[PDB]
Design a protein around this nucleic acid. Structure first.
Lengths: 118, 88, 94, 47, 275, 58
RNA sequence: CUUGAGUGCAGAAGAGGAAAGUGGAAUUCCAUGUGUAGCGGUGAAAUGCGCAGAGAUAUGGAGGAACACCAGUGGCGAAGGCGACUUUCUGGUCUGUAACUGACGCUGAUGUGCGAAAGCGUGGGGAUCAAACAGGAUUAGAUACCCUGGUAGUCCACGCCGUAAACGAUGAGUGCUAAGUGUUAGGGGGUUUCCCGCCCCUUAGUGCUGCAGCUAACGCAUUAAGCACUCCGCCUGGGGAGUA
């Protein structure tokens, strides 16, 4: 530490918009360890959107998460996208011991005015 | 507003017979008090859309009843336009 | 004349001595105008579903007072903003 | 011993049952306050 | 109130005034007065230093007990009254003791009202006290900077300060000038914004009023022959050529600061915007 | 019947909300409409005193 | 004289209004921490942002907005419109009762006041959004769609303006004229050991389907576009023109 903070229960932040999905894993609070993006995995455009691109970022950062060492990991989910069910199926095979999955993608309470078009 | 107490109070002075609830001297009196109180309500609350609507309707109704009165009797009519002091 | 219920909520972290002094003080605020303090209660040490400022739980408290309509909030829900210990409040009718 | 896919299913109705999809669907772009009620005055007989 | 004088001639067209229904009495005391001369912008030497002052109406000085030193004791107001020396009206006091001392006029201060100057005083208008004993979100004025000097800030017409938060010491403020300074926690202060607020919303109407005060005419630079002012000279009218629009002793006007970085206030200020 | 709510009937509040923090509508209750109108007000008043949350998603 | 109208008596509901006062999420920004190399957006890209450390993640703070689920072909409003909560003031509506007045009523030119959004002025505040606008891309061409941003304004008070597809494309009121089915506020009767369960009747509103009748036809049909009465306003081929 502060590079090698060693734990056994962190958390996995996930988002999947309709143009991209990224992922990153940290400790409980948390603070950064690693991430990945389909645009960093070489992909582009539509391929950022695929479930397949979600899997590969999930793994390819998850390995950096077992760098310092970690088995259990909980989930955050923003960004309704297609990869939010294939990425996880990837993640169990990543060799981890997940405990919880709670969706937070906030529906506000009539606060802000969205864009108009279309 | 008014209370049902003062509502049942004023009739005592201006009822012709103790069973009375009509005898429009009743009506114009009670309503007169109301239009005043709502007048200063509307003073402190300069704007209301419903309020003055209610006043105007109370008024046209009042003067209608009053014209039935002066149509019927005049000694009364005088008597209470100088009791309540209204319509010059 | 009207039946005004009322709540107040204080921290659990104060010493109770503050809670006592604030009770007697508080109801002293209410009944002085001619209002008729009627019914008090301590709904109790109670866990919340929400962290107000940084806390977990606290003291729910109820009193009730019957009066004519222009005597209680006039100073109550001013002092509510003043009192550091006071957290939230609420006032209703029948 | 509830497999992480079964958790993916419990989570799948967690999302499908809280209506977390269709409100973002509904709030993503502006709606005039009249057009959601042309919307519901045309859904006023479909149902 | 402000008032539309209607045009009869060409110097009452666009003008306005006050109407002075904020006042009880017209005539002030004898006792608490102090005379005053007008120097009109010039040193002990005699030399003019500041341009376009001078030439006014007679007036006098009227003392104020800004410090509000006598604390805990109660008092009242007996009257409101004009003061030319300032933009804002002011309010007399008769102590329950018996002394008499002019003090400021906040918004909505009416005769018969009472006041104190003690830290026991709970938050109402005029009740002066140390700021430590105040919540957040309270508009206040006649503030101290060092204690016991007598209040200095937010003392103008109408609006005033606003407290934002607190360390135990120092203590913060948000200001009319949109900026912030950490302040001692034990300094004296008051409650309530200042009174007269439309003092900005006069249209003077003409030039004599400005002389009646007094003020007196200024002059531009694009007419002066060039010995005096940089912008001067130039046949025909003067499209100024030198950038950095100067001031008659050099030292430009526009953009350039004068706040120097060596003052002891290096660490108090934050979020400075309105300068 | 006949007064509601304010905070006093949690085994009807809990009957009439979901785990998450939202309302179960008129349909799964099938309750009358006047108690629907009173009760929803009572809910909001009971959330504002933090007896229960705006969203319990934890 | 009361059956009209109205006051009374007892009841019922209501996003009805105006002023005030709190609360939470959510966006944007900022500070701080973690931490590396992309984020973002597209039909496909770029414009843009990114080593000054972004985005992401996390704590805290700021402040402006609009107040999620409930919400319903549900309600209230004369019309526009009215949806976080509480408070102060206040109007209006329906039911049943009826003892009081005793035809006091309907319409209403002129006249008078209310009135979406846009906008103008005095000020204030100004988070999001976005005319105008700058830029990229697209296009044979694109001032446009599309992407990137951004002003006015959106927002508060006070004033003004006085229009709309202001639509039920149906003027106000009175009264009669087949049914059946729902939803809302009530009332009354029965049943039920207690109706909470349920049945029956009725008022008011509210929708749906459909006889007669009407209709050029579409279609309305007890909330009539039927049957009749009273009052107001409006039309006389189109364009020119709601113009001079």
């Amino acid at each position: 530490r502060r590079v090698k903070k060693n734990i056994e229960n962190g958390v996995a932040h996930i988002r999947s918009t309709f143009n991209n999905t990224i992922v990153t894993i940290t400790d409980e609070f948390g603070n950064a360890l690693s991430w990945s993006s389909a645009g960093a995995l070489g992909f582009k455009g539509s391929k950022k959107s695929t479930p397949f691109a979600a899997q590969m970022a999930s793994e390819t950062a998850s390995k950096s998460a077992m760098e310092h060492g970690l088995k259990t990991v909980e989930v955050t989910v923003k960004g309704p996208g297609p990869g939010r069910e294939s990425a996880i199926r990837a993640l169990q095979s990543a060799g981890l011991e997940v405990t919880a999955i709670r969706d937070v993608t906030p529906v506000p309470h009539n606060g802000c005015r969205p864009p108009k078009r279309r | 507003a008014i209370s049902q107490e003062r509502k049942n109070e004023i009739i005592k002075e201006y009822r012709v017979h103790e069973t009375d609830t009509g005898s429009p001297e009743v009506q114009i009196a009670v309503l007169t008090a109301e239009i005043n109180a709502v007048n200063e309500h509307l003073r402190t609350h300069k704007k209301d859309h419903h309020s003055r609507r209610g006043l105007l309707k109370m008024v046209g109704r009042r003067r209608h009843l009053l014209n039935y009165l002066r149509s019927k009797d005049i000694q009364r009519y005088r008597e209470l336009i100088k009791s309540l002091g209204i319509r010059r | 004349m009207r039946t005004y219920e009322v709540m107040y909520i204080v921290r659990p972290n104060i010493e109770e001595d503050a809670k006592k002094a604030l009770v007697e003080r508080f109801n002293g605020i209410l009944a002085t105008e001619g209002a008729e303090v009627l019914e008090a209660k301590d709904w109790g040490k109670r866990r919340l579903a929400y962290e107000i400022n940084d806390f977990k739980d606290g003291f729910y408290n109820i009193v009730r007072v019957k009066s004519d309509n222009n005597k209680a909030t006039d100073e109550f829900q001013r002092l509510a903003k003043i009192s550091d210990d006071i957290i939230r409040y609420m006032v209703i009718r029948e | 011993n509830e497999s992480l896919e079964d958790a993916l299913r419990r989570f799948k109705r967690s999302v499908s049952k809280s209506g977390t999809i269709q409100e973002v669907r509904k709030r993503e772009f502006y709606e005039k306050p009249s057009v959601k009620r042309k919307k519901k005055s045309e859904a006023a007989r479909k149902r | 109130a402000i008032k539309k004088y209607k045009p009869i001639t060409n110097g009452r067209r666009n003008m306005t005034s006050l109407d002075f229904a904020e006042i009880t009495k017209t005539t002030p005391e004898k006792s608490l007065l102090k005379p005053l001369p007008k120097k009109a912008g010039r040193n002990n030497q005699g030399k003019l230093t500041v341009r376009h002052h001078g030439g006014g109406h007679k007036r006098q000085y009227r003392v104020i007990d800004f410090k509000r030193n006598k604390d805990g004791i109660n008092a009242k107001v007996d009257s409101i009254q004009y003061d030319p020396n300032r933009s804002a009206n002011i309010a007399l006091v008769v102590y329950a003791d018996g002394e008499k001392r002019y003090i400021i006029a906040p918004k909505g201060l009416e005769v018969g009202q009472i006041v104190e100057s003690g830290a026991e005083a709970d938050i109402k208008v005029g009740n002066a006290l140390p700021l430590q004993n105040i919540p957040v979100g309270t508009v206040v004025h006649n503030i101290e900077l060092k204690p016991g000097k007598g209040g200095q800030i937010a003392r103008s017409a109408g609006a005033s300060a606003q407290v934002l938060g607190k360390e135990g010491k120092y203590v913060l403020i948000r200001l009319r000038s949109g900026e912030v300074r950490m302040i001692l926690s034990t300094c004296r202060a008051t409650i309530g914004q200042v009174g007269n607020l439309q003092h900005e919303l006069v249209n003077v109407g003409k030039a004599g009023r400005s002389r009646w005060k007094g003020i007196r005419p200024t002059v531009r630079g694009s007419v002066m022959n060039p010995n005096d002012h940089p912008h001067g000279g130039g046949e025909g009218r003067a499209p100024i050529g030198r950038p950095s629009p100067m001031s008659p002793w050099g030292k430009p006007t526009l953009g350039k600061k004068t706040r120097r970085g060596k003052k002891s206030s290096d660490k108090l200020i934050v979020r400075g915007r309105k300068k | 019947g006949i007064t509601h709510i304010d905070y006093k009937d949690t085994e009807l509040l809990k009957r009439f909300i979901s785990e998450r923090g939202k309302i179960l509508p008129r349909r799964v209750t099938g309750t009358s409409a006047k108690y629907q109108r009173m009760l929803t007000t009572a809910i909001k008043r009971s959330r504002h005193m933090a007896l229960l949350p705006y969203v319990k998603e934890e």
